[PDB]
Structures are given as C-alpha cells and as structure tokens.
C-alpha cells in the first residue's frame, strides 16, 4: 500500500550519486527479469520514515514515475555505515 | 466551552464543594430523562443545595484534582460516565438513600455501587445513615 | 509569553502617569516610579495596562513578562503594600527599632545598628521577631535579606535569623 512518487534519473556515476545524496535524495533501480531495468531517484526522508515499518519488506509497494503506477517488492537495501541514511535500494517488479 | 479559557472554568471552583465533603454519590445512569433530571437536582436543592451539579466528567483523568481536599470515597470510581455528588449540609446526611430510591424508580444503571462513604471500606451498602 | 499576555487591572483610582516609558504610580499608601526597558510599550486601557514588545528587539517576549510582573507588584504594593516577618531563634537574640534604625543584639561583641532605606517601616510586637512592611517588593525583600545576612540560620540548631515561613533542615552531631 506504501506509495512513493519518483523521477527518472538522468545522470549516473559516483559523482551524480553523491550529488543526489547531498540533496536528501538517493537513487534506486527497478528490474523484473524480462523487463528493461529502470533507473530511478526518490526522496530520502519520506521513504526513510517508511523504513521504520516492518511491512516495508513485507507488502507490495507502488512506485509512481512520470504518471505511471507500478507494483514492486523491495529486494535489498544498502545503508550508510554509521549514520541512519540509505544510499540505494533494489526493487523487483512483482 | 470553545477554548482553554473555558477549560479554565473546570480547574478549582468545585474546591468549594470538596473542602468539607462528607458524602459520595455515584451512578452510571447515562439515561438523560427530563423527568428525573429535575428530580435529582431539585431534591439536591430541597435537602442540601445547588452545590452538586450535572457535570458527568468521569474518564480516567478527571477527579483527583477533582475532589482534592477530601473523599478518597470517589478516588476509585471511574468507568464509563458516572455522575459525582458530595454533601456539605450536615455531615453524612441521607442523600444516598433517596438516590437509591430513585434507582428503585428506574435509573438505568449504577456502576459498582459500594456504599461509598462510612465504611471507609468496600462493597457494604451504607446500612447506617448518620444524619 | 503567557505572563506578558495578561493585562493587569487597576484598582480604585491609583494615579497612573506614563510619561513616555517611565511609569509612575501613586497609591493611597505610596508612590513608585520605574523606567521601563526600551523593548516594551505599555498602554492604559482606561482600566488596566497592556504590554507589547517593540519590533526590532528579539527579547521583547521575555522582557514584557518581566515588565508585567513588575508593574503588577508595584500596583499591589501601592494598593496595600507587602510585609515580611523574621524570627530571631536562639538564646541571646534581641531586636528593637527606633525610628528607621533597627538595633540587633545577636551577640557578636557589639550591637549592630541597621539603617532602613527610609521607605520601609519596622515594628516589633514581640521582642524575638521583627515585622517590616514596605511599599516596594524588591526593597522589602532586600532589607529582609540583609537582616538575615547578619546571622543566617546555622543548620545545626536552627539558631540565627530566618524568615517566618522558611523551614530549616537540621543535622546531627553524628557521634555525641
């Protein structure tokens, strides 16, 4: 039921990722095996508060991108070593 | 009652009713029957006075700086809305008996009647009324 | 901000003169003047006083509460005044007031004469305790503090000068 809007990324690389993370946004990825992987960026604090709920990895999420609704499932997450911040999450279409 | 300046009108003034408190009358009759609501208050004015009123404030957070001067006799009376009444005019007079007579005259309910005051104790129904 | 947002009523016709920012009040028992901190503007609403911080001073909200408390204390004092009572507990302590000069015998070697600031009256109904009444709270409190300061209460027998309503904790000789 958790629904997050998100804007497609335009720049990839360490520099672009760090520039995003310095503006309270972190990148992420949508893939589904038989579908073209999609780069995405999504707001940091909204999903960080979504994180506390144990249902985040349990239920099916709804990602909104340029007016498109897709249903996905959180695959994995990598976090900052010491601060409670996220660099990047992995999403599987489902 | 619109704001906390009207929250005000309920944070000491019944100190005047609780300073010399010598009875505890409680009842859970949420039935707001007009005939009985000029029965009980009129009897209060007929025997004791207008000191007691219709404030049915009973949630778990109301009556400690409720009656703060005496009367633990109410101190554990707090389920779903239960009216409260004290009695000044003549220590331990007979308000409770006519309250019970109205209960005989079909007040709906009275949650956990215990003969509140002058057992200094539990359930007993206040057998003696020392007027 | 609540104290500041609480206009103080004015009794029967105590004289009130706001000449700029130096409020003067003339009660039936006294007269008191006080220049206000520039951050506050106080207006006479024909039965009371209202307080407002001037724009440009970040401390106005805190300062105005002090101003309201101060003017309330002033109006109370010039209405009827304040009174502080001290007890000289301990064998060998005596007190007596002549004029505005209070002689204390707390037993050092010599009696101690204290001069009052001339607006504060003193009285001694019983010889063991003193009652001093004043038209201004800060000064009556200061003079009471000075009277206490000569022999502040020793916490071992309660001996010394103390306020009436202040209760001293004692202590033990701990062996004998």
């Amino acid at each position: 039921m958790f629904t997050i809007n998100a804007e497609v990324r335009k720049e990839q690389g360490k520099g672009a990722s760090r520039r995003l993370r310095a503006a309270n946004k972190f990148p992420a990825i949508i893939y589904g095996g038989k579908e073209a992987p999609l780069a995405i960026e999504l707001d940091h604090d909204k999903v960080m508060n979504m994180q506390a709920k144990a249902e985040f990895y349990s239920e099916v999420l709804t990602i909104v991108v340029d007016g498109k609704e897709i249903k996905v499932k959180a695959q994995d997450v990598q976090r900052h070593p010491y601060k409670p911040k996220l660099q990047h999450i992995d999403f599987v279409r489902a | 009652m619109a704001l906390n300046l009207q929250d005000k009108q309920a944070i000491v003034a019944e100190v005047s009713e609780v300073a010399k408190g010598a009875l505890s009358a409680v009842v859970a009759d949420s039935r707001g029957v007009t005939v009985d609501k000029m029965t009980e208050l009129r009897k209060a004015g007929r025997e004791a006075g207008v000191y007691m009123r219709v404030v049915r404030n009973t949630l778990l957070r109301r009556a400690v700086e409720g009656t703060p001067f005496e009367c633990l006799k109410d101190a554990f009376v707090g389920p779903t809305l239960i009216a409260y009444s004290m009695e000044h005019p003549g220590a331990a007079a007979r308000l409770f008996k006519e309250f019970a007579k109205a209960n005989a005259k079909f007040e709906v309910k009275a949650a956990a009647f215990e003969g509140e005051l002058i057992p200094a104790s539990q359930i007993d129904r206040l057998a003696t009324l020392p007027t | 901000s609540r104290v500041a947002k609480a206009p103080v009523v004015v009794p029967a016709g105590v004289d009130v003169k706001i000449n700029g920012q130096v409020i003067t009040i003339k009660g039936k028992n006294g007269e008191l003047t006080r220049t206000l901190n520039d951050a506050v503007e106080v207006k006479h609403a024909d039965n009371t006083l209202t307080f407002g911080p001037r724009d440009g001073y970040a401390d106005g909200w805190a300062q105005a509460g002090t101003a309201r408390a101060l003017l309330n204390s002033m109006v109370i004092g010039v209405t009827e005044g304040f009174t502080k009572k001290l007890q000289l507990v301990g064998v060998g302590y005596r007190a007596a007031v002549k004029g505005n000069v209070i002689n204390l015998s707390l037993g050092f070697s010599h009696p101690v004469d204290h001069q009052l600031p001339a607006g504060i009256t003193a009285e001694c109904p019983t010889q063991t305790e003193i009652v001093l009444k004043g038209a201004d709270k800060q000064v009556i409190g200061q003079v009471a503090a000075d009277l206490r300061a000569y022999r502040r209460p020793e916490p071992y027998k309660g001996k010394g000068v103390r306020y009436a309503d202040e209760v001293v904790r004692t202590k033990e000789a701990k062996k004998k």
């Binding site: 144990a54 985040f56 990895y57 994995d76 997450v77 976090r79 070593p81 010491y82 601060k83 | - | -």
Partner: protein, 136 residues
Amino acid sequence: MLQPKRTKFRKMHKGRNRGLAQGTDVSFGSFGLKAVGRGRLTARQIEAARRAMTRAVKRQGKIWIRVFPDKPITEKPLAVRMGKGKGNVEYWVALIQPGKVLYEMDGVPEELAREAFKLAAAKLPIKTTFVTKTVM
C-alpha cells in the same frame, strides 16, 4: 586475555587504517554498539568494556564480541636508541573503522541495553552509537 594463540608471524607491519567497516550490520544480537569513529582498539580495553557489559546486567542475556585484536603492536623500550631492530610486541589491538559493530547482545530490554552500552562506551576510546537489528 583476548589474545590470539599460534600466530603465523610474531611481528606485523604498522599498516594503514583506511576505508569503511565491513560488518556494519547487527546479525547475532538485537542491540549493537556501532563505532562511528576510527582507530585501534586494544584487547585490554575490550576486556574492560566486556566486564562492564556483563556487570550492567550482573548476569543477564547473551553477548557477542564481534572484534578480535589479532594485530601485534610493538613498543620500543624506554631509554633505548632508534634502530638496532624492531621492538618486541606489547599488546594486541583491533583496527576499527567507522561502522563496525563492536559489541552485540540480545535477551535484555532495550533501555537496559542503552544503559549497558553507555557504560562500556565510557571505557571505549572511539565514538560509538546504539543500533538495533533491522529486517534488511
């Protein structure tokens, strides 16, 4: 004494302390003490903090020491000139990078864990924080 036995080589290079920690997550326990600083951390110090850890509960719970020194540290003796060899080892430290989960534990209330972790952080030499297990 929290010291390795049968070490392959008696003495080890000073090395460098660089990069981010590996075991950043809490795995065995429910509450962990994650280091947000950097720097070596001596087996004597781990012993002190572990004693404080089991002392805060006085018996309770399960604890895990996720950091093992396995790094000999040599000290040149007093009043001896430089050179003429490399001094003998004197103590063993663990190189700690930011994010490493030093202490881990479960079986006690979270607040009691907060207190115990504070007590041991008082003995530790680098900045720490309290972290809880996450679903990941």
